[PDB]
């Protein structure tokens, strides 16, 4: 019965990632004064299916790899981590209810740079390796503000428990006491997933260009699973919905609408801005987000003490 619950988690993940590609092409279409796909299916609803079947019978690109083993391991690690980030998510009840789910997600997202690094070294292109090193340095840079912002928010929660974060936000959204943390958090999640305006793997080579159409599609769907997941996590973390315990589907509808709007906000940010130069988002992290993040971490340490608003441990 638990295996049914695991499958009803992870097969809808793959379906939502499949149709997120359609939603991105359509929304980026209408924001660019054109249409998106509307020929292949009715309203383009068969475009992800057609594209999956196209990519899974395309010729293998057949690279000469420096390592065969890490070239196999990098998509496996990417998909495994992108599927295990979902299991503590309280929506309203997590699959795995763990006491330290926030730190679990921070750890499993910190492990996601090995897929980039191993795929960059497993290619024989030196320029692909340079791009992989830039992508890893970007991701580990923004993980610093992820961890410190996330700590500063959970100083209002009381624990690392993700389900407690719903109880924390029953009277007000947590974006009201922590909107500067929310906006630096949101741009840091935008820079974690290598999402525009932080997508330098498409700014003028990607780390995974030596993969065939199948494995590059697996990297791509792990990336969009990370995108939907971080939007759900940001929704749980700052926009926590009403939860009637006798009617859990009210919370499920509410966090689903908010997470969809936040994923469309990712789609709407990539339809609006040019890219950063690489040093410019390094400047954005180290010289702008990190001093404010340390200052607000001092503020959110000292603030529950000075107002007598320390959250409970349990």
């Amino acid at each position: 019965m638990f295996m049914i619950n695991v499958l009803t988690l992870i097969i809808p993940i793959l379906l939502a990632v499949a149709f997120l590609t359609l939603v991105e092409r359509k929304v980026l279409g209408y924001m660019q004064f054109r249409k998106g796909p509307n020929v292949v299916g009715p309203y383009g609803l068969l475009q992800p299916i057609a594209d999956a079947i196209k990519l899974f019978i395309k010729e293998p690109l057949r690279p000469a790899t420096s390592s065969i083993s890490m070239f196999i391991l990098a998509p496996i690690l990417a998909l495994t981590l992108a599927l295990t980030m979902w299991i503590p998510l309280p929506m309203p009840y997590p699959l795995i209810n763990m006491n330290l789910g926030v730190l679990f997600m921070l750890a499993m997202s910190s492990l996601a740079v090995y897929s980039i690094l191993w795929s960059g070294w497993a290619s024989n292109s030196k320029y692909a390796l340079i791009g992989a090193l830039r992508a890893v340095a970007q991701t580990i840079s923004y993980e610093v503000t992820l961890a410190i912002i996330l700590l500063s928010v959970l100083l209002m929660n009381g624990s690392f428990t993700l389900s407690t974060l719903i109880i924390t936000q029953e009277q007000v959204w947590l974006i009201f006491p922590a909107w500067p943390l929310a906006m630096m958090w949101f741009i840091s999640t935008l820079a974690e997933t290598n999402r525009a305006p932080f997508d330098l793997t498409e700014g003028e080579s990607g780390f995974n260009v030596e993969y065939a159409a199948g494995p590059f599609a697996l990297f791509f769907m792990a990336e969009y699973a990370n995108i939907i997941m971080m939007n759900i996590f940001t929704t749980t973390l700052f926009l926590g919905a009403f939860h009637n315990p006798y009617m859990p589907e009210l919370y499920t509808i509410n966090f689903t609408i908010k997470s969809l709007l936040l994923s469309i906000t990712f789609l709407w940010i990539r339809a609006s801005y040019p890219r950063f130069r690489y040093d410019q988002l390094m400047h954005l992290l180290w010289k702008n987000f990190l001093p404010l993040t340390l200052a607000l971490c001092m503020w959110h340490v000292s603030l529950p003490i000075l107002l007598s608003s320390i959250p409970p441990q349990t």
């Binding site: 092409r25 279409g29 660019q32 004064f33 054109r34 249409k35 998106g36 796909p37 509307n38 020929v39 292949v40 383009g44 068969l46 475009q47 299916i49 057609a50 594209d51 079947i53 196209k54 990519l55 019978i57 395309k58 010729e59 293998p60 690109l61 260009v209 065939a212 159409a213 590059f216």
Partner: protein, 156 residues
């Protein structure tokens, strides 16, 4: 028979998925690049056909040779063609890619890109309009729709 019916339906499925998800790599060589950009512009909008705008050359399905092919760039064209995964198609757009065009008798122009790469659709014009190029892309989709890969495989 059953096997002929099964390979016919699988041919229809894989031809549908290939012609409905064509990814182009456009050699924006010369003035035909401007008109390929108009075929991507919101009036015609290739992206609603499933034809994405500027896929990378190692994942694209069709090479649109849009412009004049000179002698100095013909090995680069052929190298990008050899780096494309199969099934790869070639749309020749406009007169210089088709036959040399207005620079046919030049010392430095390849007289049509079909001296360099095999070509599927010849799209005529100087430039052909964006609507004429979109006509050529839909004709390429119709050419993919009547492919018989698995039927010939079953009959061999």
């Amino acid at each position: 028979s059953r096997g002929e019916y099964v390979v016919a339906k699988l041919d229809d499925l894989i031809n549908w998925a290939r012609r409905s998800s064509l990814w182009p790599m456009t050699f924006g060589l010369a003035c035909c690049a401007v008109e390929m950009m108009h075929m991507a512009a919101p009036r015609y909008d290739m992206d609603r056909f499933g034809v994405v705008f500027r896929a990378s050359p190692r994942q694209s399905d069709v090479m649109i040779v849009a412009g004049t092919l000179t002698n100095k760039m013909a090995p680069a064209l052929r190298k990008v063609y050899d780096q494309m995964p199969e099934p790869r198609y070639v749309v020749s757009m406009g007169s210089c890619a088709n036959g040399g065009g207005y620079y046919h008798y030049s010392y430095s122009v390849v007289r049509g890109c079909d001296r360099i790469v095999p070509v599927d659709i010849y799209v005529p014009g100087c430039p052909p309009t964006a609507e004429a190029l979109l006509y050529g892309i839909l004709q390429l989709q119709k050419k993919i729709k009547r492919e018989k890969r698995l039927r010939i495989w079953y009959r061999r």
